[PDB]
């Protein structure tokens, strides 16, 4: 009997742009890029959901305004799973740590940048800040794309594998192959 462990799932992380960017005029300026990022992230989330459906049939602090709109969507349904969880948490923690950076601005908050600095320079400053946070989210989206491709390949492999006795596991499955 040989035991093998296959990842099936990854934590669904959706982003709402309305409080991630923010007035409601910054949303009009910066909504397109964040809309592509949000659409890619919900594509990743729906991909993970049908991965679980096909195979089977900051996360501690979150369990939304405190995290700048960076939420975790709960799904409707031992080494490799530990890497999946650890690098997912590393990606999310790196993202949260990177929103805390000022990104070269006079401050990392939107209240102070409209307070002690003039509007015709504040427009450039706020552009730098919000577009930098959006590029950080772009880097997170790219990492989730490549990792979602990896767990996608593993999920189709597990679906083709589904004598053998299966058991559920956190974000994955385990197979007992009797031979």
């Amino acid at each position, epitope marked *: 009997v040989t035991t093998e462990i296959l990842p099936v799932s990854m934590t669904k992380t959706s982003v709402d742009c309305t409080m991630y960017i923010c007035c409601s005029n910054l949303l009009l300026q*910066y909504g397109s890029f964040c809309t592509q990022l949000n659409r890619a992230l919900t594509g990743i989330a729906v991909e993970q959901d049908k991965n679980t459906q096909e195979v089977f049939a900051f996360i501690k602090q979150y369990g939304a305004q405190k995290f700048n709109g960076l939420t975790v969507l709960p799904p409707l349904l031992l080494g490799k799973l530990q890497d999946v969880v650890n690098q997912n948490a590393q990606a999310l923690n790196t993202l949260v740590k990177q929103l805390s*950076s*000022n*990104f070269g*601005a006079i401050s990392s908050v939107l209240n102070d940048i409209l307070s002690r600095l003039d509007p015709p320079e504040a427009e450039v400053q706020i552009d730098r800040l919000i577009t930098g946070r959006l*590029q*950080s989210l*772009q880097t997170y989206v790219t990492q989730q794309l490549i990792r979602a491709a990896e767990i996608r390949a593993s999920a189709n492999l597990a679906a083709t594998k589904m004598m053998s006795f299966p058991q559920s596991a956190p974000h994955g499955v385990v197979f007992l192959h009797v031979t």
Partner: antibody
Amino acid sequence: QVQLVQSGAEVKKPGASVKVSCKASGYTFTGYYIHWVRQAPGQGLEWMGWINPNSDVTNYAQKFQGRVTMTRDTSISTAYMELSRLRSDDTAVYYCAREATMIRGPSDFDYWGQGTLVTVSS
Amino acid sequence: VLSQPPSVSGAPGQRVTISCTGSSSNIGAGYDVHWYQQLPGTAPKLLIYGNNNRPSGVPDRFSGSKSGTSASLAITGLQAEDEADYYCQSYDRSLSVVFGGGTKLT
């Protein structure tokens, strides 16, 4: 791969304006940045200005304030430069560069464009 | 804005350093200094990003560092291909990028 390609050369006379176009391919034109930097022949690079494709807010240098208007067209992924009121000192190669992914403050110009020679003389 | 030496020379095969001196508002403020190589007749190519990091397609002989209001590039083992224009840059408090002068390593 990512490539930035420019239009042809211009032999615009003094008093006119340029329409130097920068087509960006291989990457999402929404996001990142499009900077314009000119180089006079025989001298070093001096900056002109950056446009952000998301918001169309500019940042010119203090020398080029009021004469240069960067416009972006995200449908064709192309950044137009309009340097109005040319003089004889504006004969230069007008490079189009792309700022890289910003981590902990602003970063380098990861890819550079082709060379547009704008010569201005009688 | 950034002050650099006009040109530098040297025989092939040894280490030579070029500098990049600026004010406290653009290097001393903590902004990343970047270095660029321009071969004659072509667009300048990325040489050093992130002040010490090295991108792909470029060998390890190029190196860079900062200290306070200064930055420095060094080449180890120079050859007949490395004679090209070099530039340094930094961002300021208005986040307006400033290029240094052209250094003619010849």
